[PDB]
Design a protein around this ligand. Structure first.
Ligand code: SF4
Ligand code: SF4
Ligand code: SF4
Ligand code: SF4
Ligand code: SF4
Ligand code: SF4
Ligand SMILES: [Zn+2]
Lengths: 79, 78, 190, 65
């Protein structure tokens, strides 16, 4: 239930934070999908986090490790 | 002359987590560790969304693995 | 598709990787589909073990897959499957030094069966580029003659291969390849 | 000359810790197998007829000449 922050100023729209998030990958890549909500979607060229109320993230670091030009900061402390 | 056994080997008892990698794989069955917890853990593989090897990365006792993909001419429909 | 992993289905019976369906099953299924829908043209068929000696046996094995169908459509056709470039499928023998023609056997089977129509792939004895949708044949040809080779795998669908080749007159292999198509055409009763 | 018996070897380093010829590579440990498995590599450029490592092996996995 952590909080992710995306630096819009250096986001290129690469979409490798959307493809690599394992909560996004739940809908289409799971047998009998449990939850179909998504943290990121690239609207107007930058990654927007729809997870406003910080309910779905799990601090995995797959998205921080994925962005090619580090731009996603993961906060492990309560918002 | 018989036997050599030069030195001495011990297990830092405040660090062992009772994984048993060393007892299961010791050549001479000379290690005696007993797991602190007992129970069962099950993995529903059909619900993992693929590229999320967080469980593999964080398992202390490296019990978890990504089952290696078979080669071609060996997949046999599975 | 096994070429997409790097293998080839060298006969009619071996299974596809991960699919465990066979060339025989897929040919039969497509024939049933085609004659059920009543499409104008039949199942045009390439075949297996292309371009190797001794594959007239396999050519007969793949031609025996139509023995239980009838061409039903509102258009006039008596085929149920069309076996193409058969001078390529009518080789015989073990290798390229004990290599002769099986056109006699192929056309005996075709002259028997009336639901099988063919065409010849007569080689015109010149320089040419060979393009077939199957990879393994082109790769094998490249490893034979050490000339260019292009491969275009499609996604969830087919393969490809382009390789120049010299069908020159100064080779026993090319001479016999030329003779085979003429034997096929001149052994045709119909 | 040298010959290991992979049938009776446990991949214990006590054979490659002695001679500079025997280098024992343990390929990475994975719960897949749950076992230790590697290879024993012997180079001519460093051996001798010392034969100490024959009986230093816990098992009789090594015969040399
Ligand atoms: S930390 Fe993991 S769960 Fe959270 S947004 Fe990133 S990839 Fe998704
Ligand atoms: S991976 Fe990084 S650069 Fe790409 S869209 Fe996500 S935040 Fe932006
Ligand atoms: S291998 Fe496991 S049980 Fe053995 S000493 Fe190490 S942590 Fe303890
Ligand atoms: S950490 Fe492992 S079990 Fe959990 S979602 Fe990722 S792959 Fe599945
Ligand atoms: S030769 Fe003996 S000591 Fe060396 S790895 Fe094999 S079993 Fe272990
Ligand atoms: S015989 Fe002696 S020198 Fe040769 S590998 Fe064994 S221990 Fe080393
Ligand atoms: Zn063809």
């Amino acid at each position: 239930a952590f909080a992710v922050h995306v630096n819009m100023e250096r986001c290129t729209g690469c979409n490798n934070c959307v493809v690599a998030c394992p909560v996004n990958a739940l809908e289409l890549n799971t047998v009998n999908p449990s939850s179909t909500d998504k943290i990121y979607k690239v609207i107007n060229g930058d990654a927007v986090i729809l997870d406003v109320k910080h309910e779905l993230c799990a601090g995995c670091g797959i998205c921080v490790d994925a962005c090619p030009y580090d731009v996603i900061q993961l906060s492990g402390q309560p918002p | 002359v018989g036997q050599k056994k030069l030195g001495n080997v011990n297990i830092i008892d405040e660090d062992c987590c009772t994984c048993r990698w060393c007892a299961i794989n010791c050549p001479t069955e000379a290690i005696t560790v007993n797991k602190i917890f007992e129970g069962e853990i099950t993995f529903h593989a059909e619900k993992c969304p693929g590229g999320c090897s967080t469980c593999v990365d964080v398992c202390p006792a490296n019990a978890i693995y990504l089952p290696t993909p078979k080669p071609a001419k060996d997949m046999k429909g599975q | 598709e096994a070429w997409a992993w790097g293998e080839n289905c060298t006969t009619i019976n071996d299974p596809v990787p991960y699919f465990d369906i066979t060339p025989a099953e897929i040919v039969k299924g497509l024939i049933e589909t085609n004659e059920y829908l009543g499409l104008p043209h039949s199942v045009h068929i390439h075949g297996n073990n292309l371009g190797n000696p001794g594959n007239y046996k396999d050519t007969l094995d793949t031609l025996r897959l139509a023995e239980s169908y009838k061409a039903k459509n509102k258009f006039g056709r008596e085929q149920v499957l069309h076996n193409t470039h058969i001078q390529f499928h009518s080789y015989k023998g073990t290798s390229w030094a004990d290599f002769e023609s099986g056109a006699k056997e192929i056309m005996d089977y075709v002259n028997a069966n009336k639901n099988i129509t063919c065409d010849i792939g007569q080689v015109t004895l010149d320089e040419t580029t060979t393009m077939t949708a199957d990879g393994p044949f082109e790769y094998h040809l490249n490893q034979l003659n050490h000339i260019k080779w292009a491969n275009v795998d499609v996604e969830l669908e087919t393969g490809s291969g382009v390789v120049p080749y010299i069908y020159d007159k100064n080779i026993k292999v090319c001479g016999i390849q030329w003779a085979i198509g003429l034997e096929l055409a001149l052994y045709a009763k119909d | 000359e040298f010959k290991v018996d992979d049938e009776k070897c446990t991949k214990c380093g006590i054979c490659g810790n002695l001679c500079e010829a025997i280098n024992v590579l343990h390929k990475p440990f994975s719960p897949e197998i749950g076992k230790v498995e590697g290879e024993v590599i012997w180079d001519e450029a460093y051996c001798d007829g010392c034969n100490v490592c024959a009986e230093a092996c816990p098992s009789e996995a090594i015969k040399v000449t």
